[PDB]
Amino acid sequence: HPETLVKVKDAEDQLGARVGYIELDLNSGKILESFRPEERFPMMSTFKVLLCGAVLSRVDAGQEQLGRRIHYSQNDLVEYSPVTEKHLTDGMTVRELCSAAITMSDNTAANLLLTTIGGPKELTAFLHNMGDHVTRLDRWEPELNEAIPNDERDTTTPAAMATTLRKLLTGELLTLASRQQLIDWMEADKVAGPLLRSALPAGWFIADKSGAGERGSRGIIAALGPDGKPSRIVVAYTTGSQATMDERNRQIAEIGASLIKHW
Ligand SMILES: [Xe]
Ligand SMILES: [Xe]
Ligand SMILES: [Xe]
Numbered sequence: 001h002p003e004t005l006v007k008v009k010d011a012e013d014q015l016g017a018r019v020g021y022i023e024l025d026l027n028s029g030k031i032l033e034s035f036r037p038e039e040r041f042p043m044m045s046t047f048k049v050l051l052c053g054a055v056l057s058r059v060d061a062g063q064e065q066l067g068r069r070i071h072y073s074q075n076d077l078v079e080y081s082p083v084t085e086k087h088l089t090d091g092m093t094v095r096e097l098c099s100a101a102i103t104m105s106d107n108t109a110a111n112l113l114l115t116t117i118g119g120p121k122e123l124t125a126f127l128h129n130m131g132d133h134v135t136r137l138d139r140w141e142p143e144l145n146e147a148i149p150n151d152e153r154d155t156t157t158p159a160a161m162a163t164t165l166r167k168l169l170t171g172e173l174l175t176l177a178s179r180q181q182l183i184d185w186m187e188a189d190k191v192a193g194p195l196l197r198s199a200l201p202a203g204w205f206i207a208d209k210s211g212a213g214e215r216g217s218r219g220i221i222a223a224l225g226p227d228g229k230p231s232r233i234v235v236a237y238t239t240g241s242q243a244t245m246d247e248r249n250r251q252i253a254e255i256g257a258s259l260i261k262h263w
Contacts, residue, residue: 001262011251017240020158024233037159041237044211052098054126056178066095081108102185107141134160145213194249199256216241218248
């Protein structure tokens with residue numbers, strides 16, 4: 001809706017930075033709203049959903065099992081590992097690692113999962129093979145959050161990310177079981193409280209994944225809808241701002257409010 005696009009424009013002015021935005025109808029795949037749809041933004045932790053999509057694709061092919069247990073060492077633990085730091089002795093299953101990566105944004109969980117698929121290059125190869133020739137992961141946590149201006153590493157475009165997320169959640173790629181699992185993990189996100197969720201009326205469904213990185217990078221991907229069922233995909237990214245986290249949160253929440261208001 002035009003008023004939502006105005007909020008996005010206002011966010012650009014107030015943050016002093018680019019904002020990319022897409023609204024995508026879940027069923028029809030029609031683009032309902034867009035802004036800088038073909039521009040690149042760092043994915044940050046939003047890549048963790050694509051990562052577990054690749055993992056689930058391997059589970060489908062029998063190349064991976066959700067119950068397989070991975071052990072690791074203190075040396076594997078990078079910054080912000082709230083779940084993995086608690087399981088050096090017992091290890092974690094692949095399912096537990098995806099839950100940690102998506103619901104808590106656990107960085108070590110993401111790196112371990114990357115190792116299972118062969119690293120950033122293979123995540124990118126996975127994306128390429130499902131028809132996203134735009135999105136690219138090049139680095140591991142936490143370096144992938146560097147967000148150097150004009151650097152294309154570890155970036156997506158709002159349009160590429162939106163359509164890929166749609167293909168993962170509803171497309172032909174994953175089995176029904178794996179699509180449900182991916183969405184269930186996203187619905188259980190615990191670290192996107194002040195963003196879109198903050199504008200969400202009671203009874204609405206939301207499954208999401210947020211990200212933040214260097215140089216004012218912030219973003220979120222989401223499938224949401226009223227009446228406990230998703231009906232739309234929303235992607236929003238920003239980078240370049242010197243604004244505090246709180247202001248970036250509030251800008252996304254404000255865009256969120258307009259989306260809901262004019263649903
Ligand atoms: Xe969904
Ligand atoms: Xe934003
Ligand atoms: Xe949003």
